[PDB]
Every structure is written in C-alpha cells, then in structure tokens.
Amino acid sequence: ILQHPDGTVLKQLQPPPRGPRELEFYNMVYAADCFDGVLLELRKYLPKYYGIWSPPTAPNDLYLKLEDVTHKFNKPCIMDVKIGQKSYDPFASSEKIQQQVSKYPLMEEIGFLVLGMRVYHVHSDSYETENQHYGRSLTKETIKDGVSRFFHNGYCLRKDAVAASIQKIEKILQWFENQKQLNFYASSLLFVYEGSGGEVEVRMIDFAHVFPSNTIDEGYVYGLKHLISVLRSILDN
Ligand SMILES: c1ccc(Oc2ccc(-c3onc4ccc(-c5nnn[nH]5)cc34)cc2)cc1
C-alpha cells in the first residue's frame, strides 16, 4: 500500500491469480453500466475505485488506485481485521488449506483475525503498532482485550468509536444478509477513528479471494456477528 498525498492509495496487484482477481472484482463492482442493486449498494462500503493504474513508463507494473480511507483523519487510529471462518478459497489445494488454517487455526472458532493496528496515544504524541503476530496470538480468552487495545488512547477507552464501529458493521452485515451472489475469503474490514468526536470509518478491503456464490456468505456473517458481540461487550468495560 502506497499512500499518495492526493488522498488515494496505490495497491500493487498481488501475483496471479490473486491480483487479477481483485482487479476484476473492482471492475465488476464499479462497472459503468452496472445497474445491479446489490453491487450498487456494496460500493458504499468499499474504497472508491479510480481504476487500474500503471506508471507512465512501466505498463507492466499494475496497481489499483483506491481511496485512502484514512485521508480525512488528523491522527487516524487504524485496525485491519480479516473476516470469516475460512481464509482459504473454494479452489484451494489440500496443502493450501493446511497453510491457511495453520496461519491462524482459530479462524473457524472466532471468525475474524486482527491483521494489525496503529493506535495514536495522546499523552506520548506517538503511535503503537501491532503486527500480524499480535492478532495470531489471540485466543477466545484474550480476543476481547486484544480488540479493546485498538480503542485505548492511553487515558480513556473510546467507547464512542466502539459504538460507531458496531453501527457501521451492522450496515455491512445488512448488505450481506441481502445478497447471495458473492462469497468473500481472506478479505478485511479497515477500521479508522480520530485519535486527536464520534467519527469513524469501517470499510471492506482486500478482494483477491471473492467468488461468485449461490448462498449466503455464512462464514463472513458469523465473523461480523462475533465481532459485533465482542465490541458490544467492550461497551460494558
Ligand atoms: C495496520 C494498521 C494501519 C496501517 O496503515 C494503513 C493505512 C491506510 C490503509 C488504507 O487506507 N485506504 C485503503 C484502501 C484500501 C486498502 C487495501 N486494499 N487491499 N489491501 N489494502 C488499504 C487502505 C491501510 C492501512 C497498516 C497496518
């Protein structure tokens, strides 16, 4: 992810088949002649899409030009949460499934995984960062506190941002409960709140494993429901 001062990010296509798949996902969703109500509604929850981009002198080098969801914030606190019970897709080999489940074997049970967070701390004028090992360390016993950490500015728990996050996740959940045409594997929610009131972003990102489907995305729904439940309990802290 490359942050451009113009309020966009450039995401380099991942190697095939992942990068091509994410390009086609955005292309399908933001298709100029799309009148599909499901896809039109979904746009609200994605980064705005500015199409494929490549450097003027390097047509080989493929990027997606996307809205920087953090741009409107002064001191954005950012958390990326992978959603779902399975982070492998319907066409994964046995080896690939094993690889994916071993990365975080609690995915089925919890239905989400914190990929990272960056939290602004007021009293130190500084950022705490947590990497992928943080979330992969969390268990059923420690997931609530693990998530809570995102909402601590070093003096209060930001229950405003927690409540706002629930409210925005609920809208995404409502979208999922009103579509049976896409299933999303190893995709994420990006949470952003203002670390310097109740202003928040929650957006869907990372679409290298989105597939056509005939069914509700039950794993994604489970993940959202559990994440909402965890956030709800944090409101009682
Ligand atoms: C943990 C916490 C925060 C971190 O920093 C940032 C900063 C900005 C973004 C960020 O802001 N708008 C985005 C649109 C699409 C994506 C994206 N799409 N696919 N993979 N990433 C990331 C975006 C994402 C992450 C990095 C790690």
Q: Which residues pair with 49 in a beta bridge?
A: 66
Question: Strand 76-83 and strand 187-194: pairing?
Answer: antiparallel
Q: Residue 229 Cα, ligand 1 centroid: separation in angstroms?
A: 24
Residue 5: helix, strand or coil by DSSP? coil
Which atom of ligand 1 is the closest one to the Cα of 190? 24
Q: Are 77 and 120 in contact (CB under 8 A)?
A: yes
Break sites following residues in the chain (C–N > 2.5 A): 196
The Cα 188–Cα 185 span in angstroms is 9
CA angle 114, 1, 189 (to 5 degrees): 35
**What crossing angle do the helices spanning 218-234 and 159-176 adopt, rounded to 10°?**
160
- HSE-up of 19 (CA within 13 Å, CB side)? 13
The pairing of beta strand 8-12 with beta strand 200-205: unpaired
Q: How was this structure determined?
A: X-ray
DSSP 197: -
Ligand 1 atom with the shortest distance to the CA of 79: 2
Q: What's the gap between Cα 171 and its chain centre?
A: 14
Give the DSSP H/E element, type plus range, for residue 130.
strand 126-130
d(CA 54, CA 43): 23
CA of 70 to the centre of ligand 1 (A): 8
| Per-domain residue ranges of the chain | 1-237
65 lines ligand 1 (CB under 6 A): no
150-185 in b/e form (b: 16+ CB < 10 A) is bbebeeeebebbbbbbbebbeebbeebeebeebbbb
Task: For residues 46 and 26, give the distance between their C-alpha atoms in angstroms, rounded to a whole number.
Answer: 9
The continuous run of DSSP H or E covering 225 comes out as helix 218-234
Instruction: State how far the alpha carbon of 104 is from the alpha carbons of 78, 86, 136, 153, in Å.
Output: 21, 10, 6, 28
Q: Which of 81, 113, 190 to mutate to test the pocket of ligand 1 (most atoms within 8 A of CB)?
A: 190
Task: Characterize 110-143 residue by residue with b for buried, 16 or more Cβ atoms within 10 angstroms of its Cβ, and e for exposed.
Answer: bbbbbbbbbbbbeeeeeeeebeeeebeebeeeeb
Strand order in the sheet with 2-4: 2-4, 8-12, 63-67, 49-53
Resolution of this PDB entry, in A? 1.9
165 touches 202 (CB < 8 A):
yes
Q: How far apart are the first and last CA of the chain?
A: 34
Alpha helices in 58-126 (DSSP H): 94-103, 107-110
